Amino acid sequence: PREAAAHWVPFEDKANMPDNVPDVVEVGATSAPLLSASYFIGAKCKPYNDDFMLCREESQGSGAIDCLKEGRRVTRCAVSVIEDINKSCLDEFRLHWQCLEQNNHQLSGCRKAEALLNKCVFTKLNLEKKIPGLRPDEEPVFLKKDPWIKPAVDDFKSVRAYAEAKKNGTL
Amino acid sequence: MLILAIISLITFVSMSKLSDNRAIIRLINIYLILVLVLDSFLYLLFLNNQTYTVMGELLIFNSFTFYIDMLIYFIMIVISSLYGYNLYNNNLYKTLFEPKKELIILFLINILGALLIVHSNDFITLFVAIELQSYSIYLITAIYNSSYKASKASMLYFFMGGILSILIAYSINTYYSVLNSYTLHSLDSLIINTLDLNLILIALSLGLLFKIGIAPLHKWLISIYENTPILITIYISLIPKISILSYLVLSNISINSLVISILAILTLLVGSVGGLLQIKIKRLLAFSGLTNAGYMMLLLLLNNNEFSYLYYITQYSISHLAIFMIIIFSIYYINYINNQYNPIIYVNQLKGLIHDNAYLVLSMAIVVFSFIGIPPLLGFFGKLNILMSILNNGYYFISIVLIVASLISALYYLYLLNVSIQDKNNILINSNETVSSVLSYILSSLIILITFGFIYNSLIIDIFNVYFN
Amino acid sequence: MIINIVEILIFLVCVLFSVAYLTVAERKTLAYMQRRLGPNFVGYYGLLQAFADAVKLLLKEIVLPKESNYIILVISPLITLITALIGWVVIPLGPGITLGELNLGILFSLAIGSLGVFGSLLSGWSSNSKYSLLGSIRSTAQLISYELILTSIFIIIIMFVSSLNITTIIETQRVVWYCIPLLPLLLIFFIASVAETARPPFDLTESESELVAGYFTEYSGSPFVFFFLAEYSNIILISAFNGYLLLGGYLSFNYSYLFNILFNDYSYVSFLFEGLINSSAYAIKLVFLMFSFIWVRAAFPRFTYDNLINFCWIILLPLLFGIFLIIPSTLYIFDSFPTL
Amino acid sequence: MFIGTIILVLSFLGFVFNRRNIILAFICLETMLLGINLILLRNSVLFDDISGSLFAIVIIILAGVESAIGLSLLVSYYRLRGVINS
Amino acid sequence: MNTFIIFIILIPIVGFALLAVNILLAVYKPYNEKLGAFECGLTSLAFNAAFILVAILFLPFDLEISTLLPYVMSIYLVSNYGFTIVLLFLLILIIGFVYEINTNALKINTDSLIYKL
Amino acid sequence: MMYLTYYFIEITIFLAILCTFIISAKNPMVSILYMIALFVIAAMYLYLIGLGIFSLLYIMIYIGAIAVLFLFIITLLDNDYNTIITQDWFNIENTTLLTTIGNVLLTNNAFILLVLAIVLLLGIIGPISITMKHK
Amino acid sequence: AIPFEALLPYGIIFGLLTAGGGAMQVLHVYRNGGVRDRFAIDQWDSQMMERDLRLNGGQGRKQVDQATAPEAFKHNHVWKSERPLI
Amino acid sequence: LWARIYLMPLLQAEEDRQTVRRSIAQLEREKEIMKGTGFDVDKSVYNDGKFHAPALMIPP
Numbered sequence A: 001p002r003e004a005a006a007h008w009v010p011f012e013d014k015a016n017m018p019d020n021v022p023d024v025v026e027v028g029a030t031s032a033p034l035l036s037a038s039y040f041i042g043a044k045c046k047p048y049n050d051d052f053m054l055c056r057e058e059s060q061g062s063g064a065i066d067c068l069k070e071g072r073r074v075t076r077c078a079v080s081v082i083e084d085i086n087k088s089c090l091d092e093f094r095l096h097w098q099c100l101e102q103n104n105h106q107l108s109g110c111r112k113a114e115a116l117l118n119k120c121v122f123t124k125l126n127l128e129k130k131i132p133g134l135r136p137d138e139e140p141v142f143l144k145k146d147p148w149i150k151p152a153v154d155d156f157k158s159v160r161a162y163a164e165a166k167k168n169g170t171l
Numbered sequence B: 001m002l003i004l005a006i007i008s009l010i011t012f013v014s015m016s017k018l019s020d021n022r023a024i025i026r027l028i029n030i031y032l033i034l035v036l037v038l039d040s041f042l043y044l045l046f047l048n049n050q051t052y053t054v055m056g057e058l059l060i061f062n063s064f065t066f067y068i069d070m071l072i073y074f075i076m077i078v079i080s081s082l083y084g085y086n087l088y089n090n091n092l093y094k095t096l097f098e099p100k101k102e103l104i105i106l107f108l109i110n111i112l113g114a115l116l117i118v119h120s121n122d123f124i125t126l127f128v129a130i131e132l133q134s135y136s137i138y139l140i141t142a143i144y145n146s147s148y149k150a151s152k153a154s155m156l157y158f159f160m161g162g163i164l165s166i167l168i169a170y171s172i173n174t175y176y177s178v179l180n181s182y183t184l185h186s187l188d189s190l191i192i193n194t195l196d197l198n199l200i201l202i203a204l205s206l207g208l209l210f211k212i213g214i215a216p217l218h219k220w221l222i223s224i225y226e227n228t229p230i231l232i233t234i235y236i237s238l239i240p241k242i243s244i245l246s247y248l249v250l251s252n253i254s255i256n257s258l259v260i261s262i263l264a265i266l267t268l269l270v271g272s273v274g275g276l277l278q279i280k281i282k283r284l285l286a287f288s289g290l291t292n293a294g295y296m297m298l299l300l301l302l303n304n305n306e307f308s309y310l311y312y313i314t315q316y317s318i319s320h321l322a323i324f325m326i327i328i329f330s331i332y333y334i335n336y337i338n339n340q341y342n343p344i345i346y347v348n349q350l351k352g353l354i355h356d357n358a359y360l361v362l363s364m365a366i367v368v369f370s371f372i373g374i375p376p377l378l379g380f381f382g383k384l385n386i387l388m389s390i391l392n393n394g395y396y397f398i399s400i401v402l403i404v405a406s407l408i409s410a411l412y413y414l415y416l417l418n419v420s421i422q423d424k425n426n427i428l429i430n431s432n433e434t435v436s437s438v439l440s441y442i443l444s445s446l447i448i449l450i451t452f453g454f455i456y457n458s459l460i461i462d463i464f465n466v467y468f469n
Numbered sequence C: 001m002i003i004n005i006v007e008i009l010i011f012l013v014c015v016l017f018s019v020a021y022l023t024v025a026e027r028k029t030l031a032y033m034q035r036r037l038g039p040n041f042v043g044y045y046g047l048l049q050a051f052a053d054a055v056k057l058l059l060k061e062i063v064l065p066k067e068s069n070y071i072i073l074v075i076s077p078l079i080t081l082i083t084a085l086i087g088w089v090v091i092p093l094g095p096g097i098t099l100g101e102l103n104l105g106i107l108f109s110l111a112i113g114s115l116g117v118f119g120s121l122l123s124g125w126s127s128n129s130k131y132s133l134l135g136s137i138r139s140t141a142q143l144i145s146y147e148l149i150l151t152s153i154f155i156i157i158i159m160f161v162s163s164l165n166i167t168t169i170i171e172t173q174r175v176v177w178y179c180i181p182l183l184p185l186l187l188i189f190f191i192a193s194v195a196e197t198a199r200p201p202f203d204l205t206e207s208e209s210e211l212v213a214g215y216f217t218e219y220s221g222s223p224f225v226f227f228f229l230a231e232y233s234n235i236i237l238i239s240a241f242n243g244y245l246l247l248g249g250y251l252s253f254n255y256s257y258l259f260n261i262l263f264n265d266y267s268y269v270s271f272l273f274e275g276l277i278n279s280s281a282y283a284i285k286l287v288f289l290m291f292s293f294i295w296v297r298a299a300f301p302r303f304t305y306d307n308l309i310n311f312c313w314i315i316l317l318p319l320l321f322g323i324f325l326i327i328p329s330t331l332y333i334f335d336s337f338p339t340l
Numbered sequence D: 001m002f003i004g005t006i007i008l009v010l011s012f013l014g015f016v017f018n019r020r021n022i023i024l025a026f027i028c029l030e031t032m033l034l035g036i037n038l039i040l041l042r043n044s045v046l047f048d049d050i051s052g053s054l055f056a057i058v059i060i061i062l063a064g065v066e067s068a069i070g071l072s073l074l075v076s077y078y079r080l081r082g083v084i085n086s
Numbered sequence E: 001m002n003t004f005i006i007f008i009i010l011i012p013i014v015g016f017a018l019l020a021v022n023i024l025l026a027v028y029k030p031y032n033e034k035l036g037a038f039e040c041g042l043t044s045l046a047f048n049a050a051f052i053l054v055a056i057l058f059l060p061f062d063l064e065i066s067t068l069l070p071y072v073m074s075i076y077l078v079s080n081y082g083f084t085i086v087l088l089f090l091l092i093l094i095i096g097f098v099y100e101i102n103t104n105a106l107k108i109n110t111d112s113l114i115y116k117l
Numbered sequence F: 001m002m003y004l005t006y007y008f009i010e011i012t013i014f015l016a017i018l019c020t021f022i023i024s025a026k027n028p029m030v031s032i033l034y035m036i037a038l039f040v041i042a043a044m045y046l047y048l049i050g051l052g053i054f055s056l057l058y059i060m061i062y063i064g065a066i067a068v069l070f071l072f073i074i075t076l077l078d079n080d081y082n083t084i085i086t087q088d089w090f091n092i093e094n095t096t097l098l099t100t101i102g103n104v105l106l107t108n109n110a111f112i113l114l115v116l117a118i119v120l121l122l123g124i125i126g127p128i129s130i131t132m133k134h135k
Numbered sequence G: 001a002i003p004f005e006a007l008l009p010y011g012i013i014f015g016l017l018t019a020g021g022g023a024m025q026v027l028h029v030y031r032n033g034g035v036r037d038r039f040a041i042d043q044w045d046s047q048m049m050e051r052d053l054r055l056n057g058g059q060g061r062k063q064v065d066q067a068t069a070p071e072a073f074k075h076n077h078v079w080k081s082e083r084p085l086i
Numbered sequence H: 001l002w003a004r005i006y007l008m009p010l011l012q013a014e015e016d017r018q019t020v021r022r023s024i025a026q027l028e029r030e031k032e033i034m035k036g037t038g039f040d041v042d043k044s045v046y047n048d049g050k051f052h053a054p055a056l057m058i059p060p
């Protein structure tokens, strides 16, 4: 779909869902927290996302109205994993997504906070971040040490926390 | 081969001196001959009327386009021979017929444009090929810039071709706006029934047809043909006609069109009637070309027009080349050269040619009676096939008009022979000079084809039945 | 709205005053290369010289010759000045720090540049002084010919980035400045930026010795101010193009360690300090380029028309097509086609 | 569809009823191509289809080469006569 | 109303303001001798082909250069395929450039003295 | 303020009618300057419909080269409903109009590109052939 | 020696550009609300930012990381009503 | 790219929910306006049975 052109007004619809449709909770995180949590959401909810997309394909055009149920499933899985992060690893999650807010949302600028967040989530939620499609020879960039590309300013709080973790031995 | 020739030729003509023009042109003449003979066997691909879409559905290859392609190569070979070889070795003819430095590259590029028009499967390819041919043909018109008439001609041609190209682009874009497509292959019987595309498709056909000069927009082209150098006119009057007509025949977008019917009628009448009062040779020949373009336009109103159109276009190409070559040869016996671009201009300048060269007039008679359609020359069978097609499809009034137009045009066809078999007081006594062997052999080959082609008619139809069915 | 206004006034004032002081800097630098002093009397240390010339020219009568199209003669300098200044809207002094953050920033730069030959093309027709006509035709020829070289170097650089956002092109250069792998391309951009700006040695367009004055022979008062201002603003702007295409724009060095020492959290102090560092890097690059324009003016004699046309179309353009062939070939060999 | 159509038709009428100059003729050609292209591009946008824009790019390039060749023809025409009296 | 459009609007206003200041403040005393065109102090057209030719050949070469914009914006997506296509395109154009060079398109008494003894 | 952006399309249309001053110009120059004005109006309209990159390409080519040539030469010679704009998330790449044009032109239509190369080759050879007198 | 009077205008230009850029950094940060700017943003980013506006109450680029969305998020959805491109 | 892929299903799902709501809502609105008239509001303009979100609103 194309973006809007010369003159447009945004308009809001005040109707409710039809009551036959089961209600569902909506994901409340914004762009930076969502981008921070994306890899864990994928790792956990991959089967449900795949099922949702397969339903949308097989519906062959009526996807919006035939694929509501596993859409509810997808949103519920996403909300569950975000809640788990909010319960178990909140401080590192905030480090990561505030760092992203500062660095134009480039994951390359938040490797230090991302290491802490990844360790916390692996230990307390058993989710691993992994980049699909790479051969064993190719190395995931977020695991690479001494990258060519570095942020302008290493985030202050993230640097302090990373050095602290290096002392504690958690990282 | 054609692209490779163009590239190499650009390199050489850059690095060669002005005296090497004719040797270069002989080189390309032989190269085209070699391609025609060595690569001819690719016909075998088209057995059972097998069609191939190529280049991501931009180009279409079938027996029809293969034949048009071979015909265009044959025409290019003949036309390049006229530049690559001197009729006579005297000073006068060095002045009369010298090839420009870039002329051969322009010829090859215009040929490429014509071949891409023929093969075009998509409208973008059609438009790019049309513009390629149009630009190259503008430049060919203009390359002899010492002529006032040639420059005036090139400018008028630029403007008329530009307007017709804009009409064509508009038609293409309206077709896009209605169907969100650039291919005619998307069209079907259901779609034609469902939607009224008649206006768009007829605008596209008219934009293409006014570029070869059908009435009522003829006169600008006849003026251009009159005002160009004679060896340029032999080319620019033929190749665009072939390419555009072949594309339209292959596309079949004006079947039973009432507007095309009326315009074909008008073209026949204007080509036949308007050529009667002519006194200049090339204007006479241009009105001939207009009438014959009318005969071919009739074939755009019906399906299964492949045989009649191919036969007609081939025999017309041969007759047209031959009549221009005869006019060229008859230059050696005129007593007044009008100028260096058009040595002979008035029909009456041939008066008494039979006393100077009897067999030149024999060849002239043969080609003229082919144009009139006297059996068993090729022209008769061309007209016979056309009449067969249009009567099979119920174009009765158009058939009557075609009869009448052939009758009328016979008058200014026979005008040439009439003045040619009259008597001149000063009759050649002797000469040491020999006409060039090569061009005389080529002219003779064309004459013998026109005379004795009919013996192969049944063999041709047998071949046709297996490659186009 | 208020913030937008303040940003525009700050940027506009900085650009206009930088152009004004570039003229003084030129006179002073040439002066010291010629063992003399240059303006040191109008204002302390000659710092008000440019405003003195300005005020004088704004008080000067406008002369409209008899055979002239007065509308065209007055509007041609105006349009060339407008385009020369409009070109500044996309120049960043830091990541995203610009008046116009366009995803088509490069295309905007090239287009507004291509709108730069119209002053030369129109003034000769407007003046009707014959010297102006000769200058105008020769200039139009030279400028378009060298615009080709500039556009070709633009394309070669985008081969490495695959983006028309200027900030992105600058950001990709943290790894290395593009003037390191493409040093010969940097030399050609200077030689061509000199020519495209119509500066010596390539000042054939308005050379006093071949043609008195130049296309401006007839321009007095504010129209002369406009041609003058447009010329120096274009000098700075094309130095800016050079800066962000090849010299890494506002990138100087990795100051992450230093900031982590100085500060412990984000603050307006630290944002301001970062802004000053980026802007200082970009402005020092601009200063070296402007100094180089003045240096080359001091060192070399002029070309002739035939000479510069021969240069551009027989020595430079073949090399640039050769580079067109050799840059994607090297990308292909090492499997480094840049992503979007 | 509106701006392009009107540019096309007004440029066409300027071309036909030109009895002032040949430069007007060149300009009407160029502006006709402009109007064709504007109609094309609006249709491209409405369909969210790339074929329209591809053909628009090709028209741009061909109009460039057509302008080059046409001006060269005009210059060659001028070389013989010294003056264009239209 | 972002900074872009406001700046774009603002620049011509500044130009017009400087022009109006000049018109308002400067004297204006035209007379015939002042209105004469300046040619070194006293009152008082064939050209070469290369003048025409630089301008005319600018347009094809400009189009060639600007035809590579789609390529450089899609280099990765077209991979080693588009790569080869754009090489062929470039070489075809280079041929025309060679023609231009070899024809010397843009470029603008040695007899002995013999006595009949 | 809102009626401005609403009628912006209709204003470009009106200015285009008015500028097509090209036909009635006393001076052909002046006619060429008005042609440039028409081209700027075209660039304005193109941005409005969502094709700004085309606005910039038009400025680059038709004004930067074609209008420059025009001037060079002549100095030398003597539907009331509103559309619903909806979002979806299936596009993860940063693919714009220029990238898609490059993609299709260099892969699906490489043939059109090479034929355009031949057309530009013509645009070089022709002018040399007719404006230059060899030897 | 190094001629400082020749360097004074260069110093003026350098300070002018440096101060102008620093002031522009501070104004951009202040407009953004304490974070740096977003550059080179595609369609995806624009849509994400619109969704952010729906989530955080229209407070610009403010971010919320609560798992569950407020009630008003379900009703403040916006489609755009775009005028006919004539 | 992989991050965006992992986010796409949930964002889409939300958008499909909004689409169904606003399409249905407009259907009931138009039906209510058309009560008392011999017109069927539920009949699609399309011949396939597939769901078709409205385009082309009435100007507001």
Ligand SMILES: CCCCC/C=C/C/C=C\CCCCCCCC(=O)O[C@H](COC(=O)CCCCCCCCCCCCCCC)COP(=O)([O-])OCC[N+](C)(C)C
Residues within 6 Å of the ligand: B036, B037, B040, B041, B043, B063, B066, B067, B070, B071, B074, B306, B307, B310, B311, B312, B314, B315, B378, B449, B452, B453, B454, B456, B460, B461, B463, B464, B467
């Ligand atoms: C050693 C290789 C030399 C071959 C070079 C061919 C050059 C073509 C140049 C000019 C065209 C000139 C005449 C073309 C003949 C049609 C062939 C054919 O039969 O037409 C059919 C299709 O019938 C048609 O639609 C009607 C054709 C209309 C012909 C009108 C003239 C009739 C009289 C000509 C008599 C022939 C002279 C023989 C004298 C002994 C295509 O046949 P095809 O596609 O299967 O290819 C043939 C196999 N080939 C490639 C190896 C040669």
